[model samples]
Target: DAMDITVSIPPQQYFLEKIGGDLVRVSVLVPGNNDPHTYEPKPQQLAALSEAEAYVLIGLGFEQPWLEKLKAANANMKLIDSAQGITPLEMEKMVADPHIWLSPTLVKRQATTIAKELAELDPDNRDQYEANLAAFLAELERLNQELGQILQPLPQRKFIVFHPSWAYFARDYNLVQIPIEVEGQEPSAQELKQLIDTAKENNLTMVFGETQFSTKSSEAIAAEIGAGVELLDPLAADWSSNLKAVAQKIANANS
Candidate 1:
């Protein structure tokens, strides 16, 4: 029997399908187009939860409030916490960056947790799950090394983003991200001026915009600083290539 699995976000679907393969069917609670912090599942979506044998949560704001509700819908559902062992980085001693999947290093840890939970649910196919996990881990390690090498020679490691979803990614790659959107709120006039001045001072020629969030602030800041706004989607479904592209974009900004 193919098991049904539910994940908090679309990116988790990639990981589950990679390890679960044809053995499981996965559903994302928060659609890729919507912001997780504000997305709420419909009654029909909640009704579908009854079919899921396991639910893997990322422990972010999007999933935190609804985990209990999901559990209530299906008492037999096995809950797997992907962010259990990872130490989340908070911005300014607040606002936890829940974008752990943005970093290949952190995603590996989440993958291990997902693999173990899937194996527990499907013990008979444990060997297959283990094998898939090993292959994925190897690929992730290769990507980590490749990204590190790609970013090593960048003269400027700091880049600007509309949403600060890349703290873990920046930390992993020894880079810095100056976010225009602070704590899910748009920057005020004073804050925006400060950002523009800071960007001009640093000679930043570009600001990365996200598809999910409005690019207004980024565009404004860019116009004032004579910088171009380049869209970089951290929520993109293709995790591997997106991070690679992000590194290339950040490196390009320095040149």
Candidate 2:
């Protein structure tokens, strides 16, 4: 009876409590502190998906490299890619990162999408879903404003990152990011040197890494460039409050 939380679970869970109210039972696949890139599902999880109404996907490299294998696990599931209309940032010319919910603005869009989907799935609670979605939107708007203000005072528009997950956030906030890893590959010596050069040249205040990857990469670069390295959760779609807290951490990271 629970909605399965794939890579896109937090907002879904947020809506489950709001729009779903006591009407829906939801279970998210990705657990907190667990990286989706390397997540292995158990047999019971497959059983849950078999009974789920809809399986919302975060829709990038965050899922099922072997689509046939995943589909075989739950052939009856309704596969939904919630990232339908947003223009995704390409990690390289080849790859796209699935961390789309990092921005409050994007989550606002996703909330509307989820609300619409929930209303369709459970028409009896349509009004409730819509109302809850509106409330969530308002809160996210305020959050966006707060983050904008936090970023507004920064001396430079450029920042460094270990993972490319925060592209949506930086894009929404009018900031540019230089990720140390490119196309899932660690930076070469020359690449590392170039990043340090860029960071030092710009007086870069922060170097960001995510929970999944080793901080050694970003830490080494930050150490060489005289910058502070911080870990930002790249795949924290399990808890909305935790997501908001992590978002706030990113906002305050410049200090």
Candidate 3:
């Protein structure tokens, strides 16, 4: 059996498994269907953190309130910030987006840190951990290159989304993502009208919604702009391919 590790979101579980494979068991605070922005760790789940060998943090909004208590629950747990060594994207000066894994290029950096941490935790399996890391890095590199090619031809480089989670992905691929919602709040009436105007002006054909959250806002905007609501899960377990799928969807919107 693999040693237990914990992370802040479901997508991190995918990264941990990709690099750690059968060598590590992972538990995520934000499940596949949960919203990380509002998710709170349950008592039992917080208690369980004490037993984990390490905890991988993504430095998200949900962490702001409960992280100290979580760390207190597990004094010995090695907390690894996967967002480390990368310049974070902010909604404003103080607010950093936690959805960093959506970009393959950003993920390659996290994988590098994860491999180092895994090697430290399980020295006996160091070789296995490094090998897995190498293989996954190669996959990430290929994914990044292919995603660039997929996005390069688009006449309209801007795409619309309900949540602002894809900023990192858009930045990496050199595309623009206009969000319908701001900081988890649905846009005001005036803002909504402006979004519709922007959509019409840009000839946007689709508005992206995520599986974990309600699609009402995105659907409403789609209706006003005569655009379709396309579902894209930033928290999917299959991280690499899901991003490629997102790129293809954006390409379709422009085509």
Q: What TM-score does candidate 2 get on C-alpha atoms?
A: 0.84
Clashes of each: 0, 3, 0
TM-score of each: 0.96, 0.84, 0.95
Q: Pick the candidate with the highest TM-score.
A: 1
**For candidate 1, lDDT tens digit of each residue in 26-78?**
98888787777777788898899999999998864447678768978899999
Q: Rank the candidates by TM-score, best first.
A: 1, 3, 2
Residue 56, candidate 2: Cα error in Å is 1.2
CA lDDT, candidate 2, residue 96:
71
- Is candidate 2 or 3 superior in lDDT? 3
- How are the candidates ranked when ordered by lDDT, highest leading? 1, 3, 2
Better of 1 and 3 by lDDT: 1
Off-target runs (Cα >4 Å) in candidate 2 are 1-12, 15-18, 38-40, 60-66, 95-97, 237-255
Query: Model 2 clash tally?
Result: 3
Clashing pairs in 2: 2-25, 2-26, 3-26
Q: Candidate 2, 115: how far from true, in Å? A: 1.7
TM-score of 3: 0.95
User: What ranges in model 3 sit over 4 Å off?
Assistant: 60-62
